[PDB]
Design a protein around this ligand. Structure first.
Ligand code: UQ
Ligand code: NDP
Ligand code: ZN
Lengths: 96, 86, 230, 342, 115, 208, 125
C-alpha cells in the first residue's frame, strides 16, 4: 500500500520522501522515481493466524531446504500470537 | 595595573620545591588571612621546576622561578609581588 | 555544612593521630566540568552575576536556568555556545554551535581530580565547530587574539595555568587538609533548620539530568516506564 | 540552510559545496569552463541544453556521479525554464549568439530570453542570479549586438533587482572567436584592418579569469546587486595586437587598410551562409570599436582575481595555428607587444 | 657510532657535491624539456620549480638520506630526458587545478572541520 | 586422521634437515639459522653481507647446484628494527629440490645485487625497489618498474594507505589528465574480524 | 667501511607522504581494550598504532559515507610499546601513548558463597 506525500512524491516502503525544501528532487525531473508497490508489511498482515494443538510449533518458512533455518516457536502466551522471527507467519493455539 | 591572581606550582617530592613546601606548611594560612579575596592557587608540578605566576589587569602575566628557594626567599618574593614591585 | 564536616575530620585526625596517607575528607561531585573549572580558577556558583549584573553574558553550555533575563538588566547581550537547544538557547541573542563530547578531543577532570581526554569519534554536524576554536576565532576577530592556534598549544597553556591537567592518568595529589581546616574556622555561618533532602529522590529523577539526557527518547521511555509500570 | 546544501568535504570532486546551479548556455565557450569550475568544487550543476545530446558529452567528466544533470528546454517556452530552475539556488545566464539566425534575433537572445530567465527565477525563489553582458553595451551603440545587450541588462535588472551583472570584454582562450578569428584571416593572404587598426584599443580578458570571477561572485555574499567589469591588465592598439598574434603563430603579417563601407559590404557578403558565418557586419562593428573605460565599476581585483596577461596564455591558443617548422618554439621567443596604458 | 653502512657518501661533503652535480644536470636539462614537451611555461619558471624541489629537502642532515634523494632525482631526470614521462607528468609539479588551500586560523575555521 | 589430514613425509624431512646441516657447516660466516617446516620446506637465514657468497655457492656447488631462481620478493614487518625481509626461492633441477634463503635490511641499508649470480633477479630487485624502497647496490639499471612515472612512495609498505594519496582525472580547462588529492565517494569499510579466542595453542607466545 | 651517522633517524623525505599528513596528524599507540560483549582476551596482546579521526560526510547520491582522509583505515601492529614509538618517531608523526591496562589478580573462592557469618553468602545458586 503505497501512499503520496503532500509534495506529490510516492513514499517508499521505508517511508522516505524528499522534503519540499530538498533540492535532490531535481534528479527526478523529466524522469521517474523507482518505487515498489508490494509492501511486505501489508502483505504479511493478510496471512491468517494458524491454530495448532501443541505448545511448541516449528517453522522453516515452507519448502524445506528452500525456506529459512528451522526454528521452534512457543505458544504458552494467550494474549499474543507466536511470530516467526524469519518469515513473519503467526501461530496460536485453540482458545476461548 | 593591579594583581588579580597568584599561582604557585610546587613539585611535590622534588628537592628544589622543599622550601616552597615549607612555606605552604607554615606561612600560607597567614597570607590567606591577609588577603581574603586574592586567589592564590596552589597547584601540583611535574618533575621540571617550581614556579610562581602573577596575573595583572587585562591579562598580563609573568612568572618567577622558585627553584631551591628557601621559605624566606619565597615569602620575600610574595611580599615583592603583593607590593607595587616587580 | 562544609565547616561541620571539616570539624568532624579534624576531630578524627587529632584523635586517631596521623594514620599515614588516608585523606579522610572527601567531596563527591556530580558535574563533569566542575573540577576542571575549579582547577582553572573559576568562581563556583553564580553569586557574582546576581551581585554585579553584566551587560554581556557568555553562556558556555549553561542550561541549569540559574540566571534568566529577569536577573539581568534590559538590552543585555546574552551569547549561548553549545550543542543542544535547551533552557539557555531561546534567551540568547547569538547562538554559536559547538561540538559534543563525542565530536572533540577534550579534557575532563574526575571527581578524584584525575584528568582524562576524550577522542574524536564523529565530526560535529552542520557548521558546528570545536569550542576552544570558536573562542579563539572570536578573540582574533575582536583583535585581542589568543596566543595558541592548535590543540597542543592550548594544552600547553592549560599546563601553564594548572600543570595537573596534562597528566592524563595520575591521581596522586598533596593533602593540605589542616590549612583549609584552619581557614574554615574564621567564618561562623549558622546552620539552617531545613532537612537535607537530595534532588535525586527516586529512579525517575535520574534519567534526565543534562541537555543530552533531556533530548533522548530512550530516557523519556525509561521515565514513562518508571512512572507507570504497565 | 536546507542542510543538504551546507558545504561538506575538502572542496574536492566528491565534496559538497552547497551550490545548485542552473547554467544556461553551458554548451558554449564560457559555459564549459563555468561548468568545469562548478564541478571541481563538488556542486550540483543543472545543464539546460537545446542542441543534440552528443554536443554535451564533453561536459560528462566534469562532475562526480549524479552531480551534472542534463535537461532539454526551449528559449521561447517558460515552462521548460521553470522546470530547469525549480530547485536551484544559483542561476547563471550565458545565452548568446554572435550572429542572427532566421529563428532568433539579437533581441530574442539578449533581451527576451534573459528577461524570461530572470522573471522565472524570481518567481521560483532563486536566491542568486548571475547575468553576463558586454563591457561595450550601450543603448545608442552602432551595433545591434550591444544595443540588445544594454536593453537586456536593463530588463534583467528590472525583473531581478538583486542580480549580479558581469561585463567582460573580448574573452580569449582555446575556443574563442577573438584570437582564432584574427589568426584565421591568414587564409586570405592579407589582413584587412580599418584605419590599419590604429584607431582602436582593446583590453581582452582571459577565459579562466572570467570563470573564476563568476565563481567568486557566486560565493561572494556582498555582490548581490553589483555590476562588474572584467577586463585584462593591458590595453593594446588593434594593429599591435594583431601583429603580436601573427608573431606568436609565426605567420607572415601583411596588413592593409580597408575602408569601412567596403569591409561592411564584405561582412554582408559573408552573412549569407546558412552555417556559422565567418564574419558579419556586427562583428565588423564590434572589432573596430575601442574598449570602454569604466573606472566606477568593480573588477576582477575586487573578487580576489588577478588578471592574466595575454603574453602568458597566447601560446596555448596560437600554437595550433603554427606550421610544423615553428611548432616547438618557446613562449619566451615573441617579445611582447607595446601597451598604451594611461 | 650507531654502526651505519654507507650507500655512496662518507660524510656531508660528498653528499653535497652529488647534490650540486644533480642540480647542474637539472638546470642544464630544463630548456630541452620545455622545447620537447611543448610546455607553455617559461624556462625561468621551470628552473624555479627545480630550485624549489631541491630546497624542499634542504633540512636533511643524514648523508644516507641525501644519497637516496639524489638517486631518486637521477631517476626522475632519466625519465624526463628519455621522454618516458608525458606532458601530464611534467606538469603535475605545478598543481594548476588545485585551489589554494588557506593557512591562517580564521580561513580554516570558516571552511571545514579540520585544521 | 586419514581422510581429511595432509599426509606427512619424513624421508624428505630428514633429507632437507641433513642438507641444512651441510649448508650451515660449509658457511659459518654468513648462515645465522636453518629451519625445516612440517610441510617439508627448507629455509636458511643468513647475514646480509653473505647474499652474493651463499647464493653463488648454492648455484655453483656440485652438491647444491640450485640453477633456477624461482622468485625474489620482500616482506614488510614494521615492528622489527630491520624492517624489510628479503626472500630468495631457488630451484635445483639436478636434485629436484627447492630452497629458501632469507635476509633482512632497513630503509637506508643497501643490499648487493644478485644479477651476477642470477640474471633473472634484474627485474625482481627493481620491483623490490619499486614496491618497498629497498636499494640494491651495483644494479645495471635500477628504476621504477610497476608504478606510474613520478609516483611518490612505495605502496607495498604496511604504512602506505590502500588507496594512496593522489588520484587522476581529466581536466578540460588545462586539457590534460591531472592528479589531485584523493577523495572517495564511499570510504573503504574496515572490518574487525579477529576472534577474541585463540585458535592454535601450538603457536602460543610467552605470557609477557 | 662505516660512516657513523649521529643525529636522529628521519625518513620523512623518502616516504612520499604529503606534508599536511605528517605535521598535522596525531597517532595513538595503545593496546585495544577487550570487547565487553565477550570474555576472550586474544585481541589484547599486541600494540596498535592508529590515526586521529577526520571528517566523514554523506554522498549526495545514494547517501554513502564519503571521506577525504587517506589514513582513515590504517592500523599498524607492533610487539612492544617502544617499537611503535620508534616507528612513529622515524616517520615524523606526533604520538600519544596509553600505558597497558591489565586486570589485577582477584581472589576467588567458591566456599565464600556459603559463609556462616560474612555477607558473602549468596541468596540463590
Ligand atoms: C576557428 O573558427 C573558424 C572556422 O572554423 C574552423 C572557419 O572555418 C573559418 C573560415 C574558413 C577558412 C579557415 C578557410 C579559408 C579557405 C580559403 C580562404 C579559400 C580561398 C582560396 C581560393 C578559393 C583558392 C584559389 C585561390 C584564389 C586566389 C582564386 C574561420 C574564419 C574561423 O574563424
Ligand atoms: N568575446 C566573448 O566571448 C565574450 C562573450 N560575451 C557573452 O558571454 C555569453 C557566453 O559567451 P560564449 O560562451 O562565448 O558564446 P557561445 O556562442 O559560445 O555559446 C552561447 C550559449 O548560448 C546558447 N545559445 C545560443 N543561442 C541560443 C538560443 N537562440 N537559444 C538558446 N540558447 C542559445 C548556446 O547553446 P548551443 O551551442 O546549443 O547553440 C550556447 O550554449 C554570451 O551571452 C556572450 O554574449 C561577453 C563579452 C564577450
Ligand atoms: Zn517462518
Amino acid at each position: 500500500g503505497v501512499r503520496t506525500s503532500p509534495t506529490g512524491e510516492k513514499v517508499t516502503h521505508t517511508g522516505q520522501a524528499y522534503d519540499d525544501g530538498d533540492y535532490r528532487r531535481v534528479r527526478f525531473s523529466d524522469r521517474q522515481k523507482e518505487v515498489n508497490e508490494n509492501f511486505a508489511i501489508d502483505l504479511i498482515a493478510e496471512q491468517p493466524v494458524s491454530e495448532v494443538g501443541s505448545r511448541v510449533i516449528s517453522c522453516d518458512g515452507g519448502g524445506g531446504a528452500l525456506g529459512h533455518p528451522r526454528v521452534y516457536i512457543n505458544l504458552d502466551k494467550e494474549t499474543k500470537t507466536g511470530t516467526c522471527g524469519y518469515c513473519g507467519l503467526q501461530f496460536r493455539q485453540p482458545h476461548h | 595595573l593591579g594583581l588579580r591572581e597568584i599561582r604557585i606550582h610546587l613539585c611535590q617530592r622534588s628537592p628544589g620545591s622543599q622550601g616552597v613546601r615549607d612555606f605552604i606548611e607554615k606561612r600560607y594560612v597567614e597570607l590567606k588571612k591577609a588577603n581574603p579575596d586574592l586567589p592564590i592557587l596552589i597547584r601540583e608540578c611535574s618533575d621540571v621546576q617550581p614556579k610562581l605566576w602573577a596575573r595583572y589587569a587585562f591579562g598580563q602575566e609573568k612568572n618567577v622561578s622558585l627553584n631551591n628557594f628557601s621559605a624566606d626567599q619565597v615569602t620575600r618574593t610574595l611580599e615583592n609581588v603583593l607590593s607595587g614591585k616587580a | 555544612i562544609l565547616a561541620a564536616v571539616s570539624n568532624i575530620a579534624q576531630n578524627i585526625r587529632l584523635s586517631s593521630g596521623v594514620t599515614g596517607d588516608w585523606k579522610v575528607m572527601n567531596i563527591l561531585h556530580r558535574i563533569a566540568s566542575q573540577v576542571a573549572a575549579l582547577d582553572l580558577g573559576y568562581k563556583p556558583g553564580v553569586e557574582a552575576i546576581r551581585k554585579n549584573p553584566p551587560k554581556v553574558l557568555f553562556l558556555l553550555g549553561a542550561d541549569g536556568g540559574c540566571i534568566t533575563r529577569q536577573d539581568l538588566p534590559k538590552d543585555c547581550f546574552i551569547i549561548y555556545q553549545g550543542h543542544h537547544g535547551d533552557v539557555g538557547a531561546p534567551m540568547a541573542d547569538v547562538i554559536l554551535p559547538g561540538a559534543a563530547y563525542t565530536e572533540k578531543s577534550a579534557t575532563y577532570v574526575n571527581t578524584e581530580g584525575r584528568a582524562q581526554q576524550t577522542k574524536v569519534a564523529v565530526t560535529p554536524p552542520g557548521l558546528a565547530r570545536e569550542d576552544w576554536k570558536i573562542i579563539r576565532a572570536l578573540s582574533e576577530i575582536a583583535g585581542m587574539t589568543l596566543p595558541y592556534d592548535t590543540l597542543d598549544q592550548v594544552r600547553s597553556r592549560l599546563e601553564e595555568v594548572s600543570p595537573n591537567l596534562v597528566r592524563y592518568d595520575d591521581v596522586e595529589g598533596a593533602n593540605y587538609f589542616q590549612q583549609a581546616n584552619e581557614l574554615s574556622k574564621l567564618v561562623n555561618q549558622q546552620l539552617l533548620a531545613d532537612p537535607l533532602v537530595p534532588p535525586q529522590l527516586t529512579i525517575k529523577d535520574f534519567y534526565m539530568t543534562d541537555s543530552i539526557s533531556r533530548a533522548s527518547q530512550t530516557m523519556a521511555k525509561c521515565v514513562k516506564a518508571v512512572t507507570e509500570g504497565i | 540552510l536546507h542542510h543538504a546544501l551546507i558545504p561538506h568535504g575538502k572542496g574536492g570532486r566528491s565534496s559538497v559545496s552547497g551550490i545548485v546551479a542552473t547554467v544556461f548556455g553551458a554548451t558554449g565557450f564560457l559555459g564549459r569552463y563555468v561548468v568545469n569550475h562548478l564541478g571541481r568544487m563538488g556542486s550540483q550543476v543543472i545543464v539546460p541544453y537545446r542542441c543534440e545530446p552528443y554536443d554535451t558529452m564533453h561536459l560528462r567528466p566534469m562532475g562526480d556521479l549524479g552531480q551534472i544533470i542534463f535537461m532539454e528546454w526551449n528559449g521561447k517556452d517558460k515552462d521548460s525554464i521553470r522546470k530547469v530552475v525549480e530547485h536551484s539556488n544559483v542561476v547563471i545566464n550565458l545565452v548568446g549568439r554572435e550572429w542572427e539566425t532566421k529563428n532568433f534575433d539579437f533581441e530574442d537572445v539578449f533581451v527576451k530570453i534573459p528577461h524570461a530567465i530572470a522573471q522565472v527565477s524570481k518567481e521560483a525563489g532563486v536566491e542568486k542570479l548571475i547575468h553576463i553582458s558586454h563591457l561595450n553595451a550601450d543603448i545608442k551603440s552602432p551595433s545591434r549586438y550591444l544595443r540588445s545587450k544594454a536593453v537586456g541588462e536593463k530588463e534583467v535588472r528590472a525583473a531581478f533587482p538583486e542580480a549580479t551583472i558581469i561585463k567582460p570584454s573580448d574573452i580569449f582562450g582555446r575556443e574563442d572567436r577573438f584570437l582564432n578569428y584574427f589568426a584565421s584571416m591568414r587564409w586570405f593572404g592579407g589582413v584587412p584592418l580599418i584605419s590599419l587598426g590604429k584607431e582602436t584599443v582593446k583590453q581582452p580578458v582571459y577565459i579562466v579569469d572570467v570563470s573564476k570571477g563568476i565563481i567568486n561572485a557566486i560565493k561572494d555574499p556582498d555582490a548581490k546587486g553589483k555590476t562588474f567589469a572584467f577586463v585584462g591588465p593591458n590595453r593594446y592598439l588593434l594593429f599591435d595586437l594583431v601583429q603580436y598574434i601573427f608573431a606568436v603563430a609565426y605567420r607572415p603579417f601583411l596588413p592593409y587598410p580597408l575602408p569601412h563601407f567596403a569591409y561592411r559590404w564584405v561582412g554582408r557578403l559573408f552573412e549569407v551562409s546558412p552555417f556559422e558565418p565567418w564574419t558579419t557586419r556586427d562583428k565588423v562593428e564590434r572589432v573596430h570599436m575601442s574598449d570602454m573605460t569604466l573606472p566606477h565599476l568593480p573588477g576582477l581585483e575586487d573578487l580576489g582575481i588577478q588578471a592574466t596577461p595575454l603574453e602568458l596564455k597566447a601560446i596555448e591558443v596560437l600554437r595550433r595555428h603554427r606550421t610544423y617548422r615553428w611548432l616547438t618554439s618557446e613562449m619566451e621567443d615573441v617579445k611582447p607587444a607595446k601597451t598604451v596604458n594611461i | 657510532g650507531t654502526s651505519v653502512k654507507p650507500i655512496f657518501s662518507r660524510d656531508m661533503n660528498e653528499a653535497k657535491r652529488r647534490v650540486r652535480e644533480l642540480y647542474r644536470a637539472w638546470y642544464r636539462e630544463v630548456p630541452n624539456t620545455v622545447h620537447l614537451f611543448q610546455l607553455d611555461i617559461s624556462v625561468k619558471q621551470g628552473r624555479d620549480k627545480v630550485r624549489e624541489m631541491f630546497m624542499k629537502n634542504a633540512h636533511v642532515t643524514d648523508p644516507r638520506v641525501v644519497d637516496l634523494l639524489v638517486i631518486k632525482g637521477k631517476m626522475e631526470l632519466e625519465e624526463t630526458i628519455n621522454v618516458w614521462k608525458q606532458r601530464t607528468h611534467i606538469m603535475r609539479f605545478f598543481h594548476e587545478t588545485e585551489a589554494p588551500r588557506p593557512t591562517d586560523f580564521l580561513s580554516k575555521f570558516y571552511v571545514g572541520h579540520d585544521p | 586422521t586419514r581422510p581429511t589430514i595432509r599426509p606427512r613425509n619424513d624421508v624428505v624431512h630428514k633429507q632437507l634437515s641433513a642438507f641444512g646441516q651441510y649448508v650451515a657447516e660449509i658457511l659459518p660466516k654468513y648462515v645465522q639459522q636453518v629451519q625445516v617446516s612440517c610441510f617439508n620446506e627448507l629455509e636458511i637465514f643468513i647475514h646480509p653481507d653473505g647474499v652474493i657468497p651463499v647464493l653463488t655457492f648454492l648455484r655453483d656447488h656440485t652438491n647444491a647446484q640450485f640453477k633456477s631462481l624461482a622468485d625474489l620478493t620482500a616482506v614488510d614487518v614494521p615492528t622489527r628494527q630491520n624492517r624489510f625481509e628479503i626472500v630468495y626461492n631457488l630451484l635445483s633441477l639436478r636434485f629436484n629440490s627447492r630452497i629458501r634463503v632469507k635476509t633482512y635490511t632497513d630503509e637506508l641499508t643497501p643490499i648487493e645485487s644478485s644479477v651476477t649470480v642470477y640474471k633473472a633477479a634484474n627485474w625482481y630487485e627493481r620491483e623490490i625497489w619499486d614496491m618497498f624502497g629497498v636499494f640494491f647496490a651495483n644494479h645495471p639499471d635500477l628504476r621504477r618498474i610497476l608504478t606510474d612515472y613520478g609516483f611518490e612512495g612505495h605502496p607495498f609498505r604496511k604504512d602506505f594507505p590502500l588507496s594512496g594519496y593522489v588520484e587522476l582525472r581529466y581536466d578540460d580547462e588545462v586539457k590534460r589528465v591531472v592528479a589531485e588529492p584523493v577523495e572517495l565517494a564511499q570510504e573503504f569499510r574496515k572490518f574487525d574480524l579477529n576472534s577474541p579466542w585463540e585458535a592454535f595453542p601450538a603457536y602460543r607466545q610467552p605470557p609477557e | 667501511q662505516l660512516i657513523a651517522v649521529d643525529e636522529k633517524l628521519d625518513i620523512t623525505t623518502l616516504t612520499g607522504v604529503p606534508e599536511e599528513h605528517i605535521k598535522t596528524r596525531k597517532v595513538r599507540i595503545f593496546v585495544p581494550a577487550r570487547n565487553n560483549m565477550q570474555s576472550g582476551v586474544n585481541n589484547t596482546k599486541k600494540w596498535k598504532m592508529e590515526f586521529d579521526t577526520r571528517e566523514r560526510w554523506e554522498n549526495p547520491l545514494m547517501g554513502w559515507s564519503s571521506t577525504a582522509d587517506p589514513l582513515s583505515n590504517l592500523v599498524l601492529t607492533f610487539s612492544t610499546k617502544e617499537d611503535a614509538v620508534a616507528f612513529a618517531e622515524k616517520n615524523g608523526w606526533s604520538f600519544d601513548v596509553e600505558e597497558r591496562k591489565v586486570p589485577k589478580p582477584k581472589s576467588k573462592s567458591y566456599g565464600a558463597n556459603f559463609s556462616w557469618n560474612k555477607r558473602t553468602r549468596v541468596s540463590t545458586k
